[PDB]
Amino acid sequence: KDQDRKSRLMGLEALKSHIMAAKAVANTMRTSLGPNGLDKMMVDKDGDVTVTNDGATILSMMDVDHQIAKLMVELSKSQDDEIGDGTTGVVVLAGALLEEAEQLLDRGIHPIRIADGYEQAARVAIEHLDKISDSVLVDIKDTEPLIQTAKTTLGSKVVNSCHRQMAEIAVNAVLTVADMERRDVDFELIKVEGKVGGRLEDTKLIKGVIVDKDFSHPQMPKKVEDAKIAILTCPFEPPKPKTKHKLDVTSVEDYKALQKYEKEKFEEMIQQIKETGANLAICQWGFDDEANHLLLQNNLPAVRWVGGPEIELIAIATGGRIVPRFSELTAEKLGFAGLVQEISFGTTKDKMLVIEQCKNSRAVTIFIRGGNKMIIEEAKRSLHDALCVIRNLIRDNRVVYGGGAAEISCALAVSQEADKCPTLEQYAMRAFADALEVIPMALSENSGMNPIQTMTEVRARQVKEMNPALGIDCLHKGTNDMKQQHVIETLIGKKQQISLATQMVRMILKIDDIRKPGES
Amino acid sequence: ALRLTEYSRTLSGMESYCVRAFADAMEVIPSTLAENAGLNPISTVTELRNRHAQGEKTAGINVRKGGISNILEELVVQPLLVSVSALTLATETVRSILKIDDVVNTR
Amino acid sequence: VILLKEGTDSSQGIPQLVSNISACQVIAEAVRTTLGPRGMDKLIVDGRGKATISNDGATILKLLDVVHPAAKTLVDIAKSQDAEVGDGTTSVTLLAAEFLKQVKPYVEEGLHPQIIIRAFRTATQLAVNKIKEIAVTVKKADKVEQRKLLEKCAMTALSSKLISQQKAFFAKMVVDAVMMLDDLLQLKMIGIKKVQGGALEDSQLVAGVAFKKTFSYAGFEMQPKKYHNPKIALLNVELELKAEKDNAEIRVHTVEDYQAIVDAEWNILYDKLEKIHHSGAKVVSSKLPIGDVATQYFADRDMFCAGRVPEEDLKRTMMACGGSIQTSVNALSADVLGRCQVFEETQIGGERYNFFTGCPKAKTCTFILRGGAEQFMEETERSLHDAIMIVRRAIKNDSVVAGGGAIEMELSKYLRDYSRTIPGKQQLLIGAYAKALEIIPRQLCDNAGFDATNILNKLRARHAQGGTWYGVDINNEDIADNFEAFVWEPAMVRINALTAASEAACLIVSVDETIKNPR
Structure with a gap:
C-alpha cells in the first residue's frame, strides 16, 4: 500500500545521484585528513559543543537521511575494530573511486563491469604492499622500537605535549593482559577512565x-x-x-x-x-x-x-x-x-x-588526568587507535612507510598492469590509479602547499631517484623520506583501507534504485 | 598516444598531467573511424592499444572489411608529411587560443 | 442531473486493454534487471525506515503491493509459482509481460482478443511436447558417480565469484550437506551461520545444529561440555536474577518478613532452576538471557545452560533433537526433551559456539561461513544457497535441459518454422509468440554487461546448424554449450514456467471492461 507520494529514483540518473550524495560525505572529511587537518564544530541536540578532528567521531555525529549516505556511516563500525585512525582515509578513497567512476559512465560502460575493474586492480595493489613492506619485531620481541612508534600516533592529537609518557603505558598494558605470542588482544579487557584536574603527564597504569x-x-x-x-x-x-x-x-x-x-x-x-x-x-x-x-x-x-x-x-x-x-x-x-x-x-x-x-x-584500566573534560575525552580516543597500532604490530609486524608513500607507490604498479588487460576493465584500472593519488594529495592541500606540484614531484623521485617509496611531509619537516621522520603505519591497516573501500564502491554501483513511501 | 604516456611518467611538475592530456586526446581519431565502421568505439580502441604495445604500427582499423586487420596488407598508406603537419599546425592554434585573455572591440 | 455512473469509473474496448498492457510492463520492469545470478540488486524501504537489499524476485513483488487490479494478477501468479516449484518467479513475470508487448500493435489494428487467446493456447501446447522430446535423463551416464556430477554443477554456478578460487573446496561441502539429508529434500532445513575472521578454507561443515551463542555472561571454568546422552530442553523462560518479566514486590511493615521476601524472590528463580533439574535436562537452551546466579547453580549440578538463542535456531533445534518448545519450566518433561550423541563447545573463531551431533530426529545441519568481513559472507550465504538448489533439484528430477536461454531459443526456432505452415491469422501471432521467448537470453547479456546484439545474433545462427544445447555464458563472453558446461534445470520447472506465463497472458487479454463499485 501507500503507492502515492512514493519517492522513486531509477535509471542512469539514479547512479549519478548516489555518487553525488557520496561525494558530499567524502568532500567533507577530506579537509580533516592528516595531522594538520582542520577541525569540525559539533552542536549536540541538547546544546553541547565539542570540537574534534577524529573521523570516526564525525561519522557517528552526522545525521544523514539519504540511504547511501547511511551505508558510508556503517563502514566506520567495521574499521574501528582494526585501524581507528585512517578511517577518514577510507571515506576519501571511497569518494575518489566514485568520482572517477562518473567519467566512465559517460562512455557507456556497465556499472558491474566497472566494479570488476576495481576488484581486479585491488589485488594488484595489495600484492605490491607485501613486497615493499619491512619488518621490525620479526623473530625478536623487544619493547624499545614498539614505544617509539606509538609516540608518532599521539602527535596528531591534543596530547602531543605529554605524548612521550603515555606511550610506555599502552605497551605494558597490552603485554600484561595478553602475550604477544598469543596474538589475541581483546578490547573488552582494557578500560579507560578519567577525571577533571591534574595534567596529562599524571597518567598511570593500574592493573x-x-x-x-x-x-x-x-x-x-x-x-x-x-x-x-x-x-x-x-x-x-x-x-x-x-x-x-x-x-x-x-x-x-x-x-x-x-x-x-x-x-x-x-x-x-x-x-x-x-x-x-x-x-x-x-x-x-x-x-x-x-x-x-x-x-x-x-x-x-x-x-x-x-x-x-x-x-x-x-x-x-x-x-x-x-x-x-x-x-x-x-x-x-x-x-x-x-x-x-x-x-x-x-x-x-x-x-x-x-x-x-x-x-x-588479564585486565587493566588506564586513568587520565587533565584540566578539561573535552581534552580527556579526546585523550581517550588518542589511546583507542594507539592500542590498535600496538595490536596490529603484534598480529603482523610487517609495516609500510606512510605519509602518502604507500598510495603513490601502488598506482605506479597498477598503471603498468593496466596495459596487460585487453578488455573494457582497463579503464577502471587506470581510474583506480588516480583515486589512490587523492589521499596523499589531500595531505599537501591541508598543509598550505600546491597539491599538484607536490604530487608529481614525488612520482619522479620514486621512479628515478630511488626505488623505495618516498613520502610527503605535511609537518614542514626537513625533507622527504619519512623513514627518517619515523612516520609508519601497519601493513594490516593498508590492506583494510583498500579492501573496505572496494566493498563500498561495489555495493553502491550495483544498487540502481531506492524505494520508500512518503507521508500520506 | 601510447608512447607519450610513458614519457609523461618520466617528467616532473605540471608536465605530467599536461602531456598525458595531450596523449589521451589522440584517441579521438581511431574512436571516430571505428564508429563509422559499425563497430564498438570503446572496445576497438582498447584492443588496439594492446596490439600496438606487443606488436608494431601494422595494427589498425580497416573500414572496408569492418574489423581490425593489418593495415599494410589492406593497401592503406599515407605519407608522413600529412601526419606531421597535422600535429604542428593544430598545436600552434591551440596554443594561440590559450594565450587569449580577452577580446576588445575598436572603431 | 440523473447520471448512470455517478462517479463510477469504468472503461471498455481497445483503450482498456491497452492500458492493462502498459501496467503489466511496469511490474516486469522492476524485476527485469534482477534476472540471473550476476543481476543487479534493489533497495526497498518500508514505513519503519529499514532497507531491504536483494535481487530475489519473489521478495520484491511482495513489498511493492501495487494497487492496480491487472498488476495484482501477475503478483498472484508468482505466489502460485512458489508452491508448485519455488523459483522462477522473475522469469514468469518477465516472460508473461513480453507476450503483451509483441501483440500490442496487432490489437490496435482491429484484431479480436479471442483470436489472440487461440494462439497462446495452441503454441504453448506444442512447446510442452517439444521440451519432453529434448529433455534427456542423465543418471548412470558415462559410469560416473553422481557425487562427481553434483560438484561440477556447483562449481559452475559459483564460478567468477569471490569463492571462485576456493570453489573446489566448497563444492564438496555443498554436495555433502545435501547428502546428509533424508529422502525428503527441503531447502529450509539446512541452516547457514556466518563467523567473521579466518580464511575461506577455515569454513567448517557441521552435521548438527549450531548457533552463534551471543551469551557473554559469567559461569566459565565449569559446566563440562562433553555429554554422551544429554536431555535437550527448549525453554523461553528468563533465568536472569533481576529481570523485566519475573520479579517479586511485596510491601510489609515487618522487618522479619523482609528476609523471606528477598528469599521468596530468589525462591521463584530457584524453583525454575529446580524444575529443570527435576526432569534431568543436561543442556538448557534459552531464548532470553540467563543471569550469572543461575549459571552457578547448573555449574555445580553438572549441567550446561546457554541463553540469548534466536527463536529460529530453537525451531530448527525442535526438529533436530526431537523435543518441543516449552514456555515454562512447570510442564518440562521427557516428552519435550531431546537427545544427541555428541555435544561439544568449540572455540573456532575465538567465539564460543555450541552444536549437536547424531540427533535421532535431526534432518538438519549447519554450515559455518569464514571470511574477512560480513559482506563477503552475506553474499556467499545466498551464493551457496543457489548451489544447494542446483544439487537438490538434480536429485529430485533427473530429466533436465540446458539452461541459460538455450531451451528458449530452440522453442523460438521450432515454432518459427511451424508458424509458416498454418495459413490464417495464426501465422502472425505464433510468429510473435516465438520472438517473445527470446527476452530471457537477452536480459542475461544486459545484466552481465555484455553486448546483447552480437551474442544473440551469433547464437541464433548457431541454432540453425542443429545444436540445441548452446546458450549464453555468464562468465566469459562467447557462445558456449550449457550442456557440456553442466548448467541444468528440471524439465518440469520449464514446463510450468510456460504454462503459468501463458495462463497469465491469456487472462489479461480476456479482460474487457473494468467495473468498480463506489464504496
Missing part, C-alpha cells in the same frame, strides 16, 4: 578494575596487603529494602525491643566477616554510624554505595563472584588482589577506589 567510590568510613584501613574481597549486593546491617525502610516505632516499648534485635544483627554480620576470613567488604549500599563503629574496632575496611555495573566489573577483575546474601558466603567467592588503596585528587572529595594486583593480570 585491575578502578571505580570512583569512597570508603564506608574515613578512618578505615587504607592498605590491605592480603587478598580477601567480599562482594555483596547488600550492606552489613539489619536487612533493608532497595528503596525505603520506614521502620514503625510506636513508643519507647517498641524502640528498646527492636533495638535489641538490631543490636544482635549489628555484631552478627560484622563478626561474620572474620568467620569467612574476608578483609575488604564491597557492598552495594552504605553503612550506618553503628556499623562503621564496629569495623574500626575489628579493622575491617569497606566500600559504600557501589554502583550496579561496578559490581560486575570488580568480581571479574578480582576473580570473585556476586553474592546476593551473606548466607551463601564461602572461601571460593572471595576476590583477589595485591593491594587496595584510596587515592584522592587534590582537595576533591572523590577519592577513587584503587584495586592493585601487585602482579600481572
Whole structure:
C-alpha cells in the first residue's frame, strides 16, 4: 500500500545521484585528513559543543537521511575494530573511486563491469604492499622500537605535549593482559577512565578494575596487603529494602525491643566477616554510624554505595563472584588482589577506589588526568587507535612507510598492469590509479602547499631517484623520506583501507534504485 | 598516444598531467573511424592499444572489411608529411587560443 | 442531473486493454534487471525506515503491493509459482509481460482478443511436447558417480565469484550437506551461520545444529561440555536474577518478613532452576538471557545452560533433537526433551559456539561461513544457497535441459518454422509468440554487461546448424554449450514456467471492461 507520494529514483540518473550524495560525505572529511587537518564544530541536540578532528567521531555525529549516505556511516563500525585512525582515509578513497567512476559512465560502460575493474586492480595493489613492506619485531620481541612508534600516533592529537609518557603505558598494558605470542588482544579487557584536574603527564597504569567510590568510613584501613574481597549486593546491617525502610516505632516499648534485635544483627554480620576470613567488604549500599563503629574496632575496611555495573566489573577483575546474601558466603567467592588503596585528587572529595594486583593480570584500566573534560575525552580516543597500532604490530609486524608513500607507490604498479588487460576493465584500472593519488594529495592541500606540484614531484623521485617509496611531509619537516621522520603505519591497516573501500564502491554501483513511501 | 604516456611518467611538475592530456586526446581519431565502421568505439580502441604495445604500427582499423586487420596488407598508406603537419599546425592554434585573455572591440 | 455512473469509473474496448498492457510492463520492469545470478540488486524501504537489499524476485513483488487490479494478477501468479516449484518467479513475470508487448500493435489494428487467446493456447501446447522430446535423463551416464556430477554443477554456478578460487573446496561441502539429508529434500532445513575472521578454507561443515551463542555472561571454568546422552530442553523462560518479566514486590511493615521476601524472590528463580533439574535436562537452551546466579547453580549440578538463542535456531533445534518448545519450566518433561550423541563447545573463531551431533530426529545441519568481513559472507550465504538448489533439484528430477536461454531459443526456432505452415491469422501471432521467448537470453547479456546484439545474433545462427544445447555464458563472453558446461534445470520447472506465463497472458487479454463499485 501507500503507492502515492512514493519517492522513486531509477535509471542512469539514479547512479549519478548516489555518487553525488557520496561525494558530499567524502568532500567533507577530506579537509580533516592528516595531522594538520582542520577541525569540525559539533552542536549536540541538547546544546553541547565539542570540537574534534577524529573521523570516526564525525561519522557517528552526522545525521544523514539519504540511504547511501547511511551505508558510508556503517563502514566506520567495521574499521574501528582494526585501524581507528585512517578511517577518514577510507571515506576519501571511497569518494575518489566514485568520482572517477562518473567519467566512465559517460562512455557507456556497465556499472558491474566497472566494479570488476576495481576488484581486479585491488589485488594488484595489495600484492605490491607485501613486497615493499619491512619488518621490525620479526623473530625478536623487544619493547624499545614498539614505544617509539606509538609516540608518532599521539602527535596528531591534543596530547602531543605529554605524548612521550603515555606511550610506555599502552605497551605494558597490552603485554600484561595478553602475550604477544598469543596474538589475541581483546578490547573488552582494557578500560579507560578519567577525571577533571591534574595534567596529562599524571597518567598511570593500574592493573585491575578502578571505580570512583569512597570508603564506608574515613578512618578505615587504607592498605590491605592480603587478598580477601567480599562482594555483596547488600550492606552489613539489619536487612533493608532497595528503596525505603520506614521502620514503625510506636513508643519507647517498641524502640528498646527492636533495638535489641538490631543490636544482635549489628555484631552478627560484622563478626561474620572474620568467620569467612574476608578483609575488604564491597557492598552495594552504605553503612550506618553503628556499623562503621564496629569495623574500626575489628579493622575491617569497606566500600559504600557501589554502583550496579561496578559490581560486575570488580568480581571479574578480582576473580570473585556476586553474592546476593551473606548466607551463601564461602572461601571460593572471595576476590583477589595485591593491594587496595584510596587515592584522592587534590582537595576533591572523590577519592577513587584503587584495586592493585601487585602482579600481572588479564585486565587493566588506564586513568587520565587533565584540566578539561573535552581534552580527556579526546585523550581517550588518542589511546583507542594507539592500542590498535600496538595490536596490529603484534598480529603482523610487517609495516609500510606512510605519509602518502604507500598510495603513490601502488598506482605506479597498477598503471603498468593496466596495459596487460585487453578488455573494457582497463579503464577502471587506470581510474583506480588516480583515486589512490587523492589521499596523499589531500595531505599537501591541508598543509598550505600546491597539491599538484607536490604530487608529481614525488612520482619522479620514486621512479628515478630511488626505488623505495618516498613520502610527503605535511609537518614542514626537513625533507622527504619519512623513514627518517619515523612516520609508519601497519601493513594490516593498508590492506583494510583498500579492501573496505572496494566493498563500498561495489555495493553502491550495483544498487540502481531506492524505494520508500512518503507521508500520506 | 601510447608512447607519450610513458614519457609523461618520466617528467616532473605540471608536465605530467599536461602531456598525458595531450596523449589521451589522440584517441579521438581511431574512436571516430571505428564508429563509422559499425563497430564498438570503446572496445576497438582498447584492443588496439594492446596490439600496438606487443606488436608494431601494422595494427589498425580497416573500414572496408569492418574489423581490425593489418593495415599494410589492406593497401592503406599515407605519407608522413600529412601526419606531421597535422600535429604542428593544430598545436600552434591551440596554443594561440590559450594565450587569449580577452577580446576588445575598436572603431 | 440523473447520471448512470455517478462517479463510477469504468472503461471498455481497445483503450482498456491497452492500458492493462502498459501496467503489466511496469511490474516486469522492476524485476527485469534482477534476472540471473550476476543481476543487479534493489533497495526497498518500508514505513519503519529499514532497507531491504536483494535481487530475489519473489521478495520484491511482495513489498511493492501495487494497487492496480491487472498488476495484482501477475503478483498472484508468482505466489502460485512458489508452491508448485519455488523459483522462477522473475522469469514468469518477465516472460508473461513480453507476450503483451509483441501483440500490442496487432490489437490496435482491429484484431479480436479471442483470436489472440487461440494462439497462446495452441503454441504453448506444442512447446510442452517439444521440451519432453529434448529433455534427456542423465543418471548412470558415462559410469560416473553422481557425487562427481553434483560438484561440477556447483562449481559452475559459483564460478567468477569471490569463492571462485576456493570453489573446489566448497563444492564438496555443498554436495555433502545435501547428502546428509533424508529422502525428503527441503531447502529450509539446512541452516547457514556466518563467523567473521579466518580464511575461506577455515569454513567448517557441521552435521548438527549450531548457533552463534551471543551469551557473554559469567559461569566459565565449569559446566563440562562433553555429554554422551544429554536431555535437550527448549525453554523461553528468563533465568536472569533481576529481570523485566519475573520479579517479586511485596510491601510489609515487618522487618522479619523482609528476609523471606528477598528469599521468596530468589525462591521463584530457584524453583525454575529446580524444575529443570527435576526432569534431568543436561543442556538448557534459552531464548532470553540467563543471569550469572543461575549459571552457578547448573555449574555445580553438572549441567550446561546457554541463553540469548534466536527463536529460529530453537525451531530448527525442535526438529533436530526431537523435543518441543516449552514456555515454562512447570510442564518440562521427557516428552519435550531431546537427545544427541555428541555435544561439544568449540572455540573456532575465538567465539564460543555450541552444536549437536547424531540427533535421532535431526534432518538438519549447519554450515559455518569464514571470511574477512560480513559482506563477503552475506553474499556467499545466498551464493551457496543457489548451489544447494542446483544439487537438490538434480536429485529430485533427473530429466533436465540446458539452461541459460538455450531451451528458449530452440522453442523460438521450432515454432518459427511451424508458424509458416498454418495459413490464417495464426501465422502472425505464433510468429510473435516465438520472438517473445527470446527476452530471457537477452536480459542475461544486459545484466552481465555484455553486448546483447552480437551474442544473440551469433547464437541464433548457431541454432540453425542443429545444436540445441548452446546458450549464453555468464562468465566469459562467447557462445558456449550449457550442456557440456553442466548448467541444468528440471524439465518440469520449464514446463510450468510456460504454462503459468501463458495462463497469465491469456487472462489479461480476456479482460474487457473494468467495473468498480463506489464504496
